[PDB]
Design a protein around this ligand. Sequence first.
Ligand SMILES: [Zn+2]
Length: 256
Amino acid sequence: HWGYGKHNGPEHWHKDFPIAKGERQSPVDIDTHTAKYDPSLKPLSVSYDQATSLRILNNGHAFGVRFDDSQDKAVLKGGPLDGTYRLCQFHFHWGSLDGQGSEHTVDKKKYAAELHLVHWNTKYGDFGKAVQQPDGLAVLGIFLKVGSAKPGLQKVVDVLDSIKTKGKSADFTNFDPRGLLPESLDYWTYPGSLTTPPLLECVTWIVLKEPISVSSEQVLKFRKLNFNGEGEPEELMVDNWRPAQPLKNRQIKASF
Ligand SMILES: [Zn+2]
């Protein structure tokens, strides 16, 4: 029964998931004074040309899109990563206003939303095995700022009315996640965790320097979703973000 409320939110998570107080928790503030350029960081490789979207869903915490990861079809490699990571899902976090909603911050600046593309290391066979490993996952984090519309987001925005409440889902085929990427693949990287329970420390975080611009119209549709199930008391899905956690003994590295 974890959530983002006063009574079940991030301050409570440690009681069921003690790793919430761990050494490699996410998200973090990225301080550009201490997130130092590492000239030895390779370019990120984002191979999404065969990406096969299956379904869109409200899981009661966010909404996201699931992909066919039975083959190498939509994969992350290079950058800080060893081997090949397959896209299972992407989802968003966002705020009760344009001023907040991102999980990562840059010099304590919050963006309107954050996109997470969630990939698992092929060497562990499936997603369930991979999350038990410190190198199990690679999550590509992308900031959303409000401005010009993102045409590659419109197909997602246009179906959110159909998944308003918790546990609703829809067939969602031929969605191209390349439409959600900024121009630049300059990135920060650090070892961390899932930002929701079970909060496992299995993630290589790759956060892009460049945010994508989405229109007010697009991000307002996000704030129409509900945490609650159909017929339960209404609870608008906003502020579904975990605040920055202590960096502790970790380094954040910049590709730029
Ligand atoms: Zn996330």
